[PDB]
Ligand binder design. Structure first.
Ligand SMILES: *[C@@H]1O[C@H](CO[C@@H]2O[C@@H](C)[C@@H](O)[C@@H](O)[C@@H]2O)[C@@H](O[C@@H]2O[C@H](CO)[C@@H](O)[C@H](O)[C@H]2NC(C)=O)[C@H](O)[C@H]1NC(C)=O
Ligand SMILES: *[C@@H]1O[C@H](CO[C@@H]2O[C@@H](C)[C@@H](O)[C@@H](O)[C@@H]2O)[C@@H](O)[C@H](O)[C@H]1NC(C)=O
Ligand SMILES: *[C@@H]1O[C@H](CO[C@@H]2O[C@@H](C)[C@@H](O)[C@@H](O)[C@@H]2O)[C@@H](O)[C@H](O)[C@H]1NC(C)=O
Ligand SMILES: *[C@@H]1O[C@H](CO[C@@H]2O[C@@H](C)[C@@H](O)[C@@H](O)[C@@H]2O)[C@@H](O)[C@H](O)[C@H]1NC(C)=O
Ligand SMILES: CN(CCC1CCCCCC1)Cc1c[nH]c2c(O)cccc12
Ligand SMILES: *[C@@H]1O[C@H](CO)[C@@H](O)[C@H](O)[C@H]1NC(C)=O
Ligand SMILES: *[C@@H]1O[C@H](CO)[C@@H](O)[C@H](O)[C@H]1NC(C)=O
Ligand SMILES: [Cl-]
Ligand SMILES: [Cl-]
Ligand SMILES: [Cl-]
Ligand SMILES: [Cl-]
Ligand SMILES: [Cl-]
Ligand SMILES: [Cl-]
Ligand SMILES: [Cl-]
Ligand code: NA
Length: 526
């Protein structure tokens, strides 16, 4: 029940899972609380304690603005924090199998939320099923988000940027120093995340200071090269200065600005965070990762292209309808409560919402490539095209480009295309296989037979859980016992990928080849 860590004893709690037991340690602190003069700084290491820390409930989530677009609707509120918001939020969770393992592989989850939101205590990130079913140890941490985690005066140590990434890193360090006392193997750690968590995982592959802190990596619906994932140093500075203007903290001495922002209440910072972008999008990342010369020594496109990353195996994938969720957060004619048949004019309006800084020719070129169809009279033509535009540009084509570039340096990569819509999905049918709704299958919630998932969904989750655990333990995401389809390595020539669904997994080639030729070759020129 009690485990001695290098900073003090911690007490866990026993959970009953599927007729067995998991030991959960919820809310272990891993840094000094970043309060007062510590706000906006890199996380500081933690002073030893003498008593028994009680890790028996999720800790505070980090300060963040909540989605209030659909009050009372589980489809959006299931992503909102479920613990008190607080700056005192640098805590992590550990699920270990019972009986205690001897040298268990470790899975470390990094949640998404656009680097502005998210928390490890969400129900769909409960690691007790993975620890129980596959006997891995599951670790998850809270890391600072928004301005509090990513405000950047690049080069200034009072606000250097990338603080939430350093929070994540300090938790990986905690696993290296402490997980053996929990029965874990520090030499067998796989990071996984979804995104912004996936984008975070891909940047740990790029950061030399994280290379010794993990073994393998899983990227669900995200990578750093996605257009929403990294802020240029230019916007980063202009966004810091805008927040100072909005808070009345405009000073000349850039350090006096940060001091002024340290005496503001978190709410004042949070409510001003929204309007710092001039023209935002539903996918806007207001304060995100930047090139800081510390965590990220150069522009990450350059690092990827020139092979400057940890050589290891990766598992990468995307969902069939990544873009649809975002259409009801601003695109005209769209609504979760009707079938969202939009016209050509509404589609053109929609592009202006998702490509605010792009020229007319750039938007016309998107329209040209996505509006040549079979039957012109199909009324959902424009509705589906906009979803595909948003999904291809923001998720599928960057993930494929990341995987191609990464595998070109000799490493084994595995790519999946998730295409099962959960039977319990509270969002409407036109949105299909949405962004975020593979997570519950990865974490094995449909293994709980009391949860109104179908039988085929329990099977699919069981297969996915085994593949993910085999990738983490062995670098190879196979399900070897129940004669599953073999998952081939993704090569830059053949570009084979595996489809995940309840009616036969299939090997396919060259996902969205024609669309991604537009987004990766043409569109960055505009
Ligand atoms: C789908 O609904 C949208 C959103 O309208 C709101 O939600 C509905 C469920 C209903 O309660 C409406 O009364 C609400 O206003 C509709 O979008 C509106 O469309 C009209 C006419 O096209 C336009 O004047 C409004 O500005 C739109 N409002 C928006 C975009 O917020 C849309 O027409 C509906 N689609 C279908 C096929 O019925
Ligand atoms: C830390 O926890 C100690 C143990 O309390 C336990 O809690 C209940 C729910 C049962 O599980 C039972 O085993 C114990 O009573 C406390 O005695 C101690 O006060 C706690 N310390 C702090 C600071 O909360
Ligand atoms: C625990 O296991 C260690 C070896 O781990 C294995 O090798 C590394 C390189 C990874 O590929 C990982 O996935 C493997 O599981 C041993 O060196 C170590 O001595 C073991 N310690 C104990 C206490 O059993
Ligand atoms: C594999 O399947 C188990 C039950 O299926 C039965 O056993 C397999 C070996 C086949 O013979 C099949 O025809 C049988 O119906 C599940 O209990 C188990 O969880 C499955 N494992 C995975 C990893 O999916
Ligand atoms: C980015 N959206 C995420 C919501 C969905 C929920 C279900 C699918 C899976 C998770 C993502 C919300 C949002 C944050 N900021 C916004 C902004 O500025 C304008 C408009 C919208 C937003
Ligand atoms: C940030 O950029 C916008 C857009 O050009 C500009 O209007 C604004 O002045 C900039 N912020 C500052 C503090 O200059
Ligand atoms: C601003 O920061 C501190 C003030 O406490 C000090 O280094 C100095 O007065 C200022 N530095 C510059 C470069 O203006
Ligand atoms: Cl201060
Ligand atoms: Cl909950
Ligand atoms: Cl089994
Ligand atoms: Cl498809
Ligand atoms: Cl299956
Ligand atoms: Cl082919
Ligand atoms: Cl395709
Ligand atoms: Na397709």
């Amino acid at each position: 029940i009690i485990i001695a860590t290098k900073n003090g004893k911690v007490r866990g709690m026993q959970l009953t899972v599927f007729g067995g037991t998991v030991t959960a340690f919820l809310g272990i602190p891993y840094a000094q609380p970043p309060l007062g003069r510590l706000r906006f700084k890199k996380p500081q290491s933690l002073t030893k304690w003498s008593d028994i820390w009680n890790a028996t409930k999720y800790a505070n989530s980090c300060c963040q603005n909540i989605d209030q677009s659909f009050p009372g609707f589980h489809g959006s509120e299931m992503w909102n924090p479920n613990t008190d918001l607080s700056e005192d939020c640098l805590y992590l969770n550990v699920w270990i199998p019972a009986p205690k393992p001897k040298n268990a592989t470790v899975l470390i989850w990094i949640y998404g939320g656009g680097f502005q939101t998210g928390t490890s205590s969400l129900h769909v990130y409960d690691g007790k099923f993975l620890a129980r079913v596959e006997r891995v140890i599951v670790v998850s941490m809270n890391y600072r988000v928004g301005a509090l985690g990513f405000l950047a005066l690049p080069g200034n140590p009072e606000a250097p940027g990338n603080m939430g990434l350093f929070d994540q890193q300090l938790a990986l360090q905690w696993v290296q120093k402490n997980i053996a006392a929990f029965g874990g193997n520090p030499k067998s750690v796989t990071l996984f995340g979804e995104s912004a968590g996936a984008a975070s995982v891909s940047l740990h592959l790029l950061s030399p200071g994280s290379h010794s802190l993990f073994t393998r990596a899983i990227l669900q619906s995200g990578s750093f090269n996605a257009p929403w994932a990294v802020t240029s140093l230019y916007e980063a500075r202009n966004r810091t200065l805008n927040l100072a203007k909005l808070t009345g903290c405009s000073r000349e001495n850039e350090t006096e600005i940060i001091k002024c922002l340290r005496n503001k209440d978190p709410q004042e910072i949070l409510l001003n965070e929204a309007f710092v972008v001039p023209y935002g999008t539903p996918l806007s990342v207001n304060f995100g990762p930047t090139v800081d010369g510390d965590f990220l020594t150069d522009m990450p496109d350059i690092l990827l292209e020139l092979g400057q990353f940890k050589k290891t195996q990766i598992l990468v994938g995307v969902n069939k309808d990544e873009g649809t969720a975002f259409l009801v957060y601003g695109a005209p004619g769209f609504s979760k409560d009707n079938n969202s048949i939009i016209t050509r004019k509404e589609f053109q309006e929609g592009l202006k919402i998702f490509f605010p800084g792009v020229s007319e020719f750039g938007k016309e070129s998107i329209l040209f490539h996505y509006t040549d169809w079979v039957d012109d009279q199909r009324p959902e033509n424009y509705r589906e095209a906009l979803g595909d535009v948003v999904g291809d540009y923001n998720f599928i084509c960057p993930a494929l480009e990341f995987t191609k570039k990464f595998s070109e340096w000799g490493n084994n990569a595995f790519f999946y295309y998730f295409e099962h819509r959960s039977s319990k999905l509270p969002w409407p049918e036109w949105m299909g296989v949405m962004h975020g709704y593979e997570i519950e299958f990865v974490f094995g919630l449909p293994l709980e037979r009391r949860d109104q998932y179908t039988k085929a969904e329990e099977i699919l989750s069981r297969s996915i859980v085994k593949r993910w655990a085999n990738f983490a333990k062995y670098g190879n995401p196979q399900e070897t016992q129940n004669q599953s389809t073999s998952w081939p390595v993704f090569k830059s020539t053949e570009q084979k990928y595996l489809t995940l669904n309840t009616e036969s997994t299939r090997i396919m080639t060259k996902l969205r080849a024609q669309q991604c030729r537009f987004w990766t070759s043409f569109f960055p020129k505009v």
